[PDB]
Design a protein around this ligand. Sequence first.
Ligand SMILES: O=C(Oc1ccc(CO)cc1)c1ccc([N+](=O)[O-])s1
Ligand SMILES: [Mn+2]
Ligand SMILES: [Mn+2]
Ligand SMILES: [Zn+2]
Ligand SMILES: [Zn+2]
Length: 146
Amino acid sequence: GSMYQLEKEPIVGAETFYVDGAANRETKLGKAGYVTNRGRQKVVTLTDTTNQKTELQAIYLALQDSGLEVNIVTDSQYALGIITQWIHNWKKRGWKTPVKNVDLVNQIIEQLIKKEKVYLAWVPAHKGIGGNEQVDKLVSAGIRKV
Ligand SMILES: O=C(Oc1ccc(CO)cc1)c1ccc([N+](=O)[O-])s1
Ligand SMILES: [Mn+2]
Ligand SMILES: [Mn+2]
Ligand SMILES: [Zn+2]
Ligand SMILES: [Zn+2]
């Protein structure tokens, strides 16, 4: 019983957003974006950012640009946990909100509860030709070598 329930399995039929972000610590330059299984993609370049911010920013773009039912695959355990924990503990007993990234996370949650159904799952970064590998390349170009 929370302020929303994420889906326990992928939403059959819904479009899938493979999100990723990448940042460079020395310059605080970074990129966030997505590729989808309906031939959609988007990459944005960011300044003054961090790796965790860019993974969160990517999810925000995916929620922003999608319909009411959406599948999101991320490789960030941080991004998944912080969003899931926020949903499960909202208005609950021992909730101290995070300090870091709190503005972006609040922005994401706001987008999130507007949705009808959201499936959000983690996969380890891996090589190959699937979705996570494609967006990883896009957000990595000029930010870090792979
Ligand atoms: O997109 C990715 O490639 C890069 C490459 C370089 C940098 C620079 O730090 C950041 C991301 C991801 C790698 C690892 C991820 N993961 O959640 O472990 S996403
Ligand atoms: Mn990543
Ligand atoms: Mn990646
Ligand atoms: Zn700057
Ligand atoms: Zn629907």
